[PDB]
Amino acid sequence: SGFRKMAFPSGKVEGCMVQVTCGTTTLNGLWLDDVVYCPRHVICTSEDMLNPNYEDLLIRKSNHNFLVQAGNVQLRVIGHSMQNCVLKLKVDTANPKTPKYKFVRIQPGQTFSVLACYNGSPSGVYQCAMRPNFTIKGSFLNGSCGSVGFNIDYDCVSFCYMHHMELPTGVHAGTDLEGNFYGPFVDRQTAQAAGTDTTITVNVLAWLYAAVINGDRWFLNRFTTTLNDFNLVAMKYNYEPLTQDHVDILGPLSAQTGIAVLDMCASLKELLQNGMNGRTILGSALLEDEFTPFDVVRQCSGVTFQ
């Protein structure tokens, strides 16, 4: 037993990380088959970043202006193209370590692992959630751009995130692997409003199920509620509305614990209205929302990869 924030094993992603240099800018690229994927702002200086015309900046670059290094192997660039906010650098060599993969665009509230990288080399792996406002609360320094987020299902790597920027607020924004930003963000060093963020209600509930399974039960109460009643409370506390689809997703955890979702909603409601009275749940003095129902089932059943 025990319950931890767990990242996917990073080995299949480590084998794909490369360094991309264009003029004086170096960041990270992802090498799958004979294509290297990286943030288009590799072609920008910090001056260009205030108001970049990517089309005109890219027209100045040839294949040989892109230095791509995989460990010590120099790759040769034989094509370049811009797709939305990503550059695709065609190289003359297939990555022999290419895992089975998919490109996926994740929904807000979904979790993924980030392999944080500098100069094409891995520094660390951590789990996070795509906030309802399509930001992530990461650990990204100067040079981390091109670091990717992913899920692993047995042998298949689903790439869902590439890192592009830090907002002035110190939260993180980036794209899917087709180069489309999550949220309204743009690859320009400018003031950018993220949404009002909200708590991922179905994730908090999943983690209350996790707590019961590990023997934390103090917050279980003799109340029930309705969806519409619970949702009036969720709106007051800036929690995402709960839908029947969310109830259906929680059903296996309901079945295990013998606690009907609406009874667990009545418990969450009392926690929102009364606070936690300085008590903890799974070693947290806050309600955690960065575990999906699928993450709680995975960690509580013992699913594996390779």
| Residues found near Na ion in the complex (CB under 5 A) | 128-129, 136-137
Which of 65, 119, 221, 224 contacts a second copy by CB under 8 A?
A: 119
CA dist 106 to 110, 143, 175, 193, 291, Å?
6, 24, 10, 21, 15
Q: How far is the CB of 284 from Na ion (least distance, A)?
A: 15
Does residue 197 belong to the site contacting a second copy (CB under 8 A)? no
Q: How far is the CB of 1 from a second copy (least distance, A)?
A: 5
Does residue 73 belong to the site contacting a second copy (CB under 8 A)? no
Q: Where are the beta strands (DSSP E) in 130-261?
A: 148-153, 156-166, 172-175
Tokens in use for 233? Answer: 């409370």
Q: How far is the CB of 56 from a second copy (least distance, A)?
A: 31
Which of 22, 87, 128, 247 contacts a second copy by CB under 8 A?
A: 128
| 16: number of Cβ within 10 Å | 23
- Partner from a second copy, Na ion, none contacting 143, C-beta within 5 to 8 A by type: a second copy
- Separation CA 154–CA 100 (nearest Å): 10
Does residue 172 belong to the site contacting a second copy (CB under 8 A)? yes
41 is a catalytic site residue: yes
Does residue 96 belong to the site contacting a second copy (CB under 8 A)? no
Helix (H, G, I), strand (E, B) or coil at 222: coil
| 90: number of Cβ within 10 Å | 16
Looking up tokens 């990380």, which residue turns up?
17
DSSP state of 65: G
- Separation CA 3–CA 110 (nearest Å): 18
Q: Which is nearer to a second copy, 58 or 167 (CB)?
A: 167
| 39: number of Cβ within 10 Å | 26
Does residue 252 belong to the site contacting a second copy (CB under 8 A)? no
Does residue 143 belong to the site contacting a second copy (CB under 8 A)? yes
- Partner from a second copy, Na ion, none contacting 5, C-beta within 5 to 8 A by type: a second copy
Catalytic residue, chosen from 41, 80, 172, 246, is: 41
Does residue 162 belong to the site contacting a second copy (CB under 8 A)? no
Tokens in use for 236? Answer: 């007051």
Does residue 139 belong to the site contacting a second copy (CB under 8 A)? yes
Applying CB under 8 A, the site for a second copy has a residue count of 58
Does residue 292 belong to the site contacting a second copy (CB under 8 A)? no
Residue 88 and residue 117 in contact, taking contact as beta carbons nearer than 8 Å: no
Which of 95, 111, 144, 267 contacts a second copy by CB under 8 A?
A: 144
Q: How far is the CB of 283 from a second copy (least distance, A)?
A: 7
Nearest CA among 39, 28, 19 for reference residue 180:
39
Among all residues, which ones are annotated catalytic? 41, 145
